[PDB]
Nucleic acid binder design. Structure first.
Ligand SMILES: [Mg+2]
Length: 580
DNA sequence: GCGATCACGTA
DNA sequence: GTACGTGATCGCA
C-alpha cells in the first residue's frame, strides 16, 4: 500500500513543470533560520523526492522556485517561504495554499497538517505529521525512506485536493478571499516576520534590574505582612495565606479552590494591607517574567531582533495571532508596563517607528452592517462614541455626562461588540443582572437598528448554520441549536460578534495588501513590521515620515467603502513607545 | 517531561 | 461576554 516515487540524486527538467505540488519540509516549530529536511515535487510527469542539499544548490531548481510563472500548490507556504528566505532563496508562484483553503472552508476544524485537511475530503492516504515526527521530546526526523514517503504522500494529497477545495471555495463565494486576500497576505506576513523588529536588549536588561529590586522590596513586605514565607506565585499557597490564615472573605471560587484573581483582590483590599502588595507584586512580576525575561529569551543574538510567527489560520474570526514572541499583547494600558515598548526600536539609525490605528473600527463596522441611523450619524459627526452612547442611554446632554456614566457606556459598547449578555455586563461593571438588563434595554431603545441586527443575525445563524463577514469569511455555529442554555447562549453571542470582529479583520488585511502595493509604487524604503488587530506598525527613514503621514492613513481609510467613514489615527517616534 | 489549572497581557 | 499566547505551579510519571 506504498506510493511509487523517484528518490532523485539530481534535479531533472521533468521536475520543473509549470504546475506542481511542492513540499519544502521544515520540521521545527519555529521555522526562522531552521533546517529544510527534504523536498517533494508531484507534477504531470511523476513524483519526486529531493535531498535539500542537492536541490537548493541546483541553479535550475532555485530558478524554478523563484519563477512566478511556474505555479506551485503547497500547504503552509509561508513556513517554506520564510525558511527559504533565511537561505537567500525566493519562493514565488504559489497559486494555491491548502492550509489557507481549509481554514476558510471551516476555521473550527483546527487544520494544522495535510492529513487533517485531507480528511475533510475523505482522503486518508497520508499520515498526520505527529505520527511521523512524534510529539514533544520524542519529536525527531525519521530516516530517509520513512521521511521521503511521508513527504511524497503529502505532495500527492495536495495534488489531489486542490480541485475539490477550490470547488467548495467557489460554491461558498470564497475563491477571491483565498486568491486575492489570504494568499497575497501570506507573502506580506512572510516579509514582515523575516524583517523582524529590533530590540534594545540593554534597556530591557536595565528595566529588569529595576523590577528585580522593586520585586525584592514588595516580596519582603508581603512576607512580613503574612508573618511567614510562602510562594507568592502559587495561587494555592496564596489562597491559604489570604483565606485561611488571614481569614479574608471568600468572594469567588475557582473549580479547584479560591479565586485570587485581580478582580477579587481589588475587592479585598480594605481588609488587609497585604492585598495591595500582592496586586503590586502581581503587576511587577508579570512584567518581569513574561515581558522582560520572556522577550530577552526570544531575541536573536545574531540580529538583536525578534522574529514573530503570525498564525494566519488559527482564529475563528479571521484575526491574526502572533507567537514567539506574541507581539500583540505588549503592555500599553498602564504606564509602568507601557515603558516595555521603549525597547522596540527601528532597525537602522536615522529611522523611526510609524504606527497607525483604526479608531473604533468594530463599532463603525456594526454601524454599517446594522444600518442603525443613530449610530451611523454619530460616526458621520465623528463624535466620541462612548460619550454619545452615555448621552443616549442616560438621556442627558453632553455636559451632564459624568466620568462614570461614560465608563458604563464604554462597557456597554464593549459588550455590544462581543455579544451582549445580562451576566457579562453585570460582572464587568460590578452591578446586578437586573441592572445590566436595564442598561442593555436602554441601549437597544437608542439603537433600534443594532437590536434588529442582533435578532436577525441570530436567526440567520440558526437558519443557514453559519454567519459571514463583509469579505465572505464564514464561521459555523452548530451549538446555536443546543438545548443547553449556556452552550446555546455562547453560540448566539458568536453569531453577533463574528460578523463584526471578522469584518474588521477583513478590512485591515485588505489595508495591508493595499499598503504594501502603494509603498512599492512610491518606491519608499518604509517597511511593515507588525499588525496588532486594529493597528499597523512600520519603520522607515526619518525622511519618509511626512509622506507616510499622508499615505498610510489614506490607504487604510480607503481599504473598503462603508456607510460611515473609517478613521485612522497615527503617530511616529524613536521607539514604539514614542509612536504615541 | 506532560498536561490541567490559574492568572494576565492585548485587541 | 470576543479573540488569543505565555509563564508558573502542581501533581502525575
Ligand atoms: Mg484603536
Amino acid at each position: 500500500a506504498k506510493m511509487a516515487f523517484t528518490l532523485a540524486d539530481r534535479v531533472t527538467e521533468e521536475m520543473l513543470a509549470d504546475k506542481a505540488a511542492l513540499v519544502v519540509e521544515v520540521v521545527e516549530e519555529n521555522y526562522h533560520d531552521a533546517p529544510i529536511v527534504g523536498i517533494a515535487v508531484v507534477n504531470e510527469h511523476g513524483r519526486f523526492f529531493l535531498r535539500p542539499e542537492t536541490a537548493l544548490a541546483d541553479p535550475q531548481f532555485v530558478a524554478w522556485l523563484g519563477d512566478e510563472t511556474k505555479k506551485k500548490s503547497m500547504f503552509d507556504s509561508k513556513r517554506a517561504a520564510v525558511a527559504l528566505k533565511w537561505k537567500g532563496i525566493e519562493l514565488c508562484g504559489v497559486s494555491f495554499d491548502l492550509l489557507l483553503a481549509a481554514y476558510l472552508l471551516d476555521p473550527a476544524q483546527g487544520v494544522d497538517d495535510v492529513a487533517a485537511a485531507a480528511k475533510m475530503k475523505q482522503y486518508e492516504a497520508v499520515r498526520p505529521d505527529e505520527a511521523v515526527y512524534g510529539k514533544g521530546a520524542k519529536r525527531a526526523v525519521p530516516d530517509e525512506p520513512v521521511l521521503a514517503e511521508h513527504l511524497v504522500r503529502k505532495a500527492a494529497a495536495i495534488w489531489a485536493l486542490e480541485r475539490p477545495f477550490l470547488d467548495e471555495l467557489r460554491r461558498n463565494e470564497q475563491d477571491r478571499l483565498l486568491v486575492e486576500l489570504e494568499q497575497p497576505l501570506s507573502s506580506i506576513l512572510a516579509e514582515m516576520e523575516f524583517a523582524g523588529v529590533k530590540v534594545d536588549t540593554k534597556r530591557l536588561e536595565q528595566m529588569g534590574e529595576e523590577l528585580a529590586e522593586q520585586l525584592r522590596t514588595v516580596e519582603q513586605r508581603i512576607y512580613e505582612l503574612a508573618g511567614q514565607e510562602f510562594n507568592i506565585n502559587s495561587p494555592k499557597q496564596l489562597g491559604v495565606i489570604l483565606f485561611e490564615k488571614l481569614q479574608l472573605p471568600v468572594l469567588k471560587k475557582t473549580k479547584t479552590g479560591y479565586s485570587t484573581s485581580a478582580d477579587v483582590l481589588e475587592k479585598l483590599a480594605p481588609y488587609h494591607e497585604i492585598v495591595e502588595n500582592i496586586l503590586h507584586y502581581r503587576q511587577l512580576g508579570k512584567l518581569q517574567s513574561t515581558y522582560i525575561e520572556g522577550l530577552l529569551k526570544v531575541v536573536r543574538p545574531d540580529t538583536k531582533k525578534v522574529h514573530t510567527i503570525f498564525n494566519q489560520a488559527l482564529t475563528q474570526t479571521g484575526r491574526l495571532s502572533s507567537t514567539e514572541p506574541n507581539l500583540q499583547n505588549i503592555p500599553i494600558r498602564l504606564e509602568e508596563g507601557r515603558k516595555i515598548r521603549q525597547a522596540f526600536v527601528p532597525s537602522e539609525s536615522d529611522w523611526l517607528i510609524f504606527a497607525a490605528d483604526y479608531s473604533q473600527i468594530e463599532l463603525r463596522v456594526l454601524a454599517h452592517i446594522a444600518e442603525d441611523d443613530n449610530l451611523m450619524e454619530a460616526f458621520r459627526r465623528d463624535l466620541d462614541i462612548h460619550t454619545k452612547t452615555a448621552m443616549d442611554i442616560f438621556q442627558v446632554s453632553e455636559d451632564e455626562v459624568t466620568p462614570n456614566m461614560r465608563r458604563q457606556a464604554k462597557a456597554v459598547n464593549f459588550g455590544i461588540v462581543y455579544g451582549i449578555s445580562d451576566y457579562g455586563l453585570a460582572q464587568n461593571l460590578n452591578i446586578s443582572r437586573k441592572e445590566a438588563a436595564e442598561f442593555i434595554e436602554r441601549y437597544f431603545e437608542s439603537f433600534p437598528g443594532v437590536k434588529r441586527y442582533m435578532e436577525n443575525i441570530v436567526q440567520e445563524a440558526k437558519q443557514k448554520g453559519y454567519v459571514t463577514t463583509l469579505l465572505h469569511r464564514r464561521r459555523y455555529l452548530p451549538d446555536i441549536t443546543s438545548r443547553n442554555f449556556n452552550v446555546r447562549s455562547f453560540a448566539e453571542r458568536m453569531a453577533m460578534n463574528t460578523p463584526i470582529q471578522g469584518s474588521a479583520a477583513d478590512i485591515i488585511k485588505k489595508a495591508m495588501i493595499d499598503l504594501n502595493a502603494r509603498l512599492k509604487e512610491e518606491r519608499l524604503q518604509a517597511r511593515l513590521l507588525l499588525q496588532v488587530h486594529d493597528e499597523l506598525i512600520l519603520e522607515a527613514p526619518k525622511e519618509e515620515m511626512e509622506r507616510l503621514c499622508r499615505l498610510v492613513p489614506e490607504v487604510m481609510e480607503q481599504a473598503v467603502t462603508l456607510r460611515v467613514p473609517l478613521k485612522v489615527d497615527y503617530h511616529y517616534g524613536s521607539t514604539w513607545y514614542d509612536a504615541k
